[model samples]
Every structure is written in C-alpha cells, then in structure tokens.
Target: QSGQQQKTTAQQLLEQTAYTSAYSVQNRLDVALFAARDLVQSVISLREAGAPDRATAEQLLKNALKSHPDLLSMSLAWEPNAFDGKDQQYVSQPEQDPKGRFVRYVDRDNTGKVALHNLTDYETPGSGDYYLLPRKLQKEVILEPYSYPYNGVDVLLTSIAVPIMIDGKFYGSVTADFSLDTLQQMVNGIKPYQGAGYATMLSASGAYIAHPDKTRISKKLEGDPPLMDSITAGKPYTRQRFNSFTNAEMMNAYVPVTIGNTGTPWMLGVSVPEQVVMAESVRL
Candidate 1:
C-alpha cells in the first residue's frame, strides 16, 4: 500500500521560507564577522610593530580602509591619555569641507569615494561612545547599530572595536564603521515562500537596524514586551505575533547573530503575513 506522499501545504512552505530567511541573515552577519576580525588583526599588528605613533596609525588606517573597500570608513580612536597627557585626540574619515560634508567628495553621488579624511576633535565625548567601549570592556566588540552624521549625512552604522595594547597599557582602539545599507540591501533581497515574506534586522538592544518601512530604521517595535524581549534575549527562536516593524500580524522567524559568545548580538528575521499563508494553506 502506497502511504500518501505527504502533500506540502502553505503552512509547510511558510515554515521553510522562514528558515531560509533566517539563513540569509546568518550569512550577512558572517560577513560582518570577517570584517571585524580583519579590522582587529590589522590594528594589532600595527601596534605590535611599534608604539603606534600618528604616522604609523595614519598609514595603518589608510591601508585598512583601502584593503577593505566594503568598510565605509575605518578609524583609530586613541585613549585620551595615551599621548602626552592629551585627551581625546584621534584621526578618522576623509577630510571634509567648511560645512564638513562629503558632498565635496570626489564622486558627485558621494555614496562613498576616496577623499582626504583626517582626525577631528575627539575631545568632545558622547554617551555610549564606541571609542571608549573597547577600553572600558578591554575586549573586542561589535557595537549595536546607530545613526551618526558623516560628512553632514546621517548614516546608519555599526562599529567594531578592539583595544591596542603597548607596554602593558591600553593604547586605544582601532574601530571600523560599516554602513547598515549593506544589511538593508541584503534584507531587501530576502524572499521566502515564493517571495511572500519580508526581512528585517535588529541590533542587540532590539532597535530596528533595517526594515522595509525605512522610517523604522532606528525605532523599536511598539508591540508587547515579550515580542522584542524574546528577540534580544540572546537566543535562537521563532514566534507568531504582531510585527511592530511593519505594523502587521505575521509569523516571525528569527536568528541571532552571535560570535564566540563575545561579539555583538544582532537579530535578523523574516515575517510572513498570516493571510497569505492562510489563503494558500486553504488551497493545500
């Protein structure tokens, strides 16, 4: 007797789509890990070669940006006291004009271009400062996604930092700023269940890093506590609920991007509206 060849239904396909959706996010984060590792190693090598003076730092950072074109920007943030009792002196990004905008970039589009970027006043400190995080934690880290002005443009960015040690003291950190557009573009590419669902990414703190709505890029979901509470709990799981990012009810399947239990925790997920699955499920 031929037992029925189990028919595939919309529910089954929806579940499968969710998996691939999670996997796409996993792949994107893997790339981030590579960039982070490379940034850390390059900075460390530069430090070990010498006491890390400005010339060497400049040369290393310039090379870091050049070699890793994927990185929108690379910088070396120094300890406030690392040099001659000075505080917050460091170099980063291309040299901007009077308005400090990249519009003057070699490229008219200015998405990214090769330009002369120099260190600005690091004296002014901000809350949750990326440069200071490494020194404080004394570890390599991938910071949660956030927005900051770059060349008079607001850019969604994530920073990776590792401390530079010389003669038993923390020299500073070599930080790399990666554009979130990369992830956003990747999310835009995700299509599971025959392209029925959408993808989104969140920082470790549950802040929306990228979403279809665009406006939700830096906001948090207005859903019940458990929805986001589960996402950032540093675990891998899936759920069905109202997706505040898109403001709809859907089945949410998520994956946590964690490296070595020490790297930053980011979540990438896929959500399919209930009606689509239900309609097709009825057909099956």
Candidate 2:
C-alpha cells in the first residue's frame, strides 16, 4: 500500500507541474495579446472621437511601439480613403505608399533604432497574410508561425491582430508581432516535476513554436493523428510517445492556451521520460 500510494503521489505531482507550467506559458504570451488589444481599442476610440488624422494617428502608433519595446513591430493598415479620407493628401510621405494608403509600420531596426516604414507586397500571399488574413476574416486572428529577418538572423515569429470595424464594416487591422524565441527560451528552461523532463509549445497549426531542438522549431508534428486531432479541436490530451530528439519514451501532457477572445488556441506540452517517472515513484 505504501508503494502504491507513493507512486500515485508522484504522478499527481507531475500532473500539477504540467498544468501550472502551461499556465505560466500562457500568461507570458498574454503580454503580446494584451498589447494588441490595447492598441486596437485605442484606434477604435480614436476613430470614434472625430477620426485620428494622419499625423495624429502616426504619433499614436509611435507611442504604442515605444511602450512595448519588446515587440518586433506594431502596425495599422487602413483601406483606401478609410483612415481619414485624406489618403491623397499623404502622397510622397516616407511612411505612405505611392498609392497614398494609410499603412504605418513601426519597427526596431538592426541597430535597435526606431524605424518607420510601410509594408511591401501586403497584397501577396505569404508576405502579406499578416495584414490580409484579419481583413479577409473580418475578425481577430493569431497567424501561423513564420520567420523574418531580425538583426541579420532569421527568427520565428507569430502575429496577433484585431480587425478594425466601423459599424460592422471591415476598415483595416492593427497588429503586434512577437518573437517565438521568448517562449523558446522559457520553455527550454522548464524542468518538470522531477527528472529530466522538458516543455514545448505548438502553434495552432501543429508547427513547433518552442522545442528542445532548435532545428525542429518550425517543423510540423507527424505520425500522431490522435494527438494532432485533439490539438486541432482545442482539447487537452495525454499520451506516451518517443521523443523525436532523444528517441526515449516519454509521457506527454498537452493543454490548449487561448489568448484574449481570439478563439484561437495554441498547444503547450510537457514531456517527461517514463523510466525516470517510474524510477522516482518506486524510490519514493
């Protein structure tokens, strides 16, 4: 009875560790989500208060980016003549396109200096989906993980965006881009309840957002239909599988993390070697 009780206690402790650690991951990600929410609300309010003209809105965007220095970029894109109905007036401005659209992109350049620019090829597929998806869907969206050149190195990133709606019409979108490296470092440092366990995170599309092996960071998980299905459905699941990096059998606990009211969920998983868990439980 003592052995059985001890084993149960160890397992229970691991389960708790998995849950709370996932909670931490979700909370950290909430920082980016909250920034997006705040910016979106500010824009909505500005539009209601007699419309933020180009100069006024540009100042607001700069201030927002300044406050959230950790973010890769902050931007607002508006349909032609929608932002202030003066898209024509802003022609030839550095931050305005030749077509005179109100698209302000604030980012930190390689030297960490505040940079202002407009998006290129924002109408194309892969390059422009960050802005186009929310406009197309007419709602908030957490885009799939992708990489961009940052400080001369390719870094994985994901975009959280909220659509601009004026009386239920899609006006444009406001977005915040965050580096997955922040989550990668946090997850890599996670030590499970006991033993040599690690934490991981997957994007809504099964792409690895954080993993022990950096090579697998953006790779998709294969050969696990049930696990993938559970994740797709935004459900919690537990399973025993071999670690792709170490080839050791492990017990994986996965939970879905939903940010704000986006309704999009990412999977946070904690995996521990089975042998270590069983050995520790027996020793206890």
Candidate 3:
C-alpha cells in the first residue's frame, strides 16, 4: 500500500509539474523578452553615442548582466566573417568547449573556432546539426534546444538571439543561451509539497523543459497527456486528471502563463494524487 501510495503521489507531482512548467516558461519568457529589449535598446543607444568602445562595451555588458540578474553572464564580440557575412559584432553569453571555457568566435570557413566558449559545455553536447552555422543564422529570433559542449559535458541549450541594428546597419546580435538543466531545476523548485511526488514542465513540442527527476530532462513525452493537450489547444486552465506515466489517479489543476506584455503562451500544472494525500486518513 505504501508503494502504491508513492506511485500515486509521483503521478500527482508529474501532473503538477506538467501544468506549472508551461506557466513558468511563459512567465520567464516574458521577463526575458522585456529585459532583452530594454537592454538591447540601451546598448544600441550607448554605441551610437560613442559612449561604448571595446573596454566600455565590456563594462556595458557587465552592467547589463547585473541589471538582469535572472539572465546569465554575457560577453560582447566582433566577428569579421560569420553567418556568411562580414564585419558582424554581437553580445552573447559564453559558449562551453572541451579544451577549456572561452568565448566562441565564428569563422564562416571553420567549425572549430572558439570565440565565446565557456565552462558550462563540459557536461553538454556541443556539436550536431543544431550547431550548424546556417541554422544559427536562419533562426535569427530564437534558437530551439540544441546539444552543445559545456563545462566538459554535452548538454542541451535553449537560446534567444535578437539582432542589433545601429544607423540602419546590422551591428550584430544579442544572444542568451540558458542551460537546460538549470531550467529544469527552476521548474522543480516551484513545487509546494515534498511528499512522494514529482513535477514536470514541457515545451509545446512535448519536450520536458523542467522535471523533478534530472534523468528525464530533455526527453520527449511519448504521448500528449490530456492536460497538456488541452493547454496546447488553448485552454487557460484544466483540472482533475490522471497521469498515464505512473498510472496514479490525481486531482490536477493547470493555468496558462500569459502574464506581462510579451504574451508568450505556456502552461502550468499541479497534481495531488488522492491516495498519497489520503494515506494518513486511511491509516486513522
């Protein structure tokens, strides 16, 4: 019975994570966009006014990093030849590489150039079609999850790239790459209970963005669970469901995260399996 109860609780947590993850992602995305736009604008203004040179640009980036504490640290770079273009400069967070952590530099002819590499790639995958130059350039707005090198590991990274235009010319871009594992932890941390349960947040593509269990991060869900399907179908909130993963009956609640001005739609889910919550009552 205890084992059965644990399974039920796990199911509940899974449901909860599924619902809440969407909402949190939407919220975070909004915060990120607003912050990114504001910072980008400020940086552009500084560049135009000749207030930022190489040294000043570094300081400016440091200030931006400080201003938006939620986004990770960032760096500024100038690439003479990248993305099949010439004389492009941008501000971006450092990439992770195997030899050591340094900013990766893009050389249109070479794939191994390290301009903005960093330590985070040690445990992450740094190479694949996702790292191809064209893909990076084509998806100029936001780059989806891709495996890359970080901190001596191969890990998944979700990135947002915003173009920087100065005086009607493209200066470069501001890119933000977030560790998938860190995102997963952020989602798991929002759970309200510690009983034998788990929670998960998934992207629209059914990729597990955040989950209580580290091992399951980045994996795709086999099927569209009811609550998530409803969220995808544009439901603001859904309730009372069971998770097929753990086969536990649960009371589930979900709310879409569409707060702030950016308006990125994501889902949030919470589940409390009847058995786990009722275990003590049953004993009494």
TM-score of each: 0.70, 0.86, 0.57
- Please provide, for model 1 over 1-284, each residue's C-alpha lDDT reduced to its tens digit, 9 standing for 90 to 100: 12122123433556566566667666655554555456556656755665555555455556656665666666555554453332323223334323221111010126555443534533335534566666777777777776666667877787666566666677666566678887687777776556777777787778887788888876767774765776657665566666689787677666776643345567777778776776776676
Best by TM-score: 2
Quote model 2's TM-score.
0.86
Estimate the TM-score for candidate 1: 0.70
Which stretches of model 3 miss by more than 4 angstroms? 1-31, 50-52, 66-70, 73-142, 165-171, 193-197, 225-234, 237-248, 258-264, 274-284
Q: All models: lDDT?
A: 0.60, 0.78, 0.50
Model 2 misplaced regions, further than 4 Å? 1-11, 92-95, 150-154, 241-249, 274-284
Which candidate has the highest lDDT of all?
2
Model 3: lDDT to the true structure: 0.50
What's the residue-level lDDT of 19 in candidate 2? 79
- Local error of candidate 1 at residue 59 (angstroms): 2.8
lDDT of 1: 0.60
Q: Report residue 18 deviation for candidate 3 (angstroms).
A: 9.4
**77 in model 2: Cα distance from truth in Å?**
0.9
The alpha-carbon deviation from the true structure for residue 153 of candidate 2, after best TM-score superposition, in angstroms, is 4.8
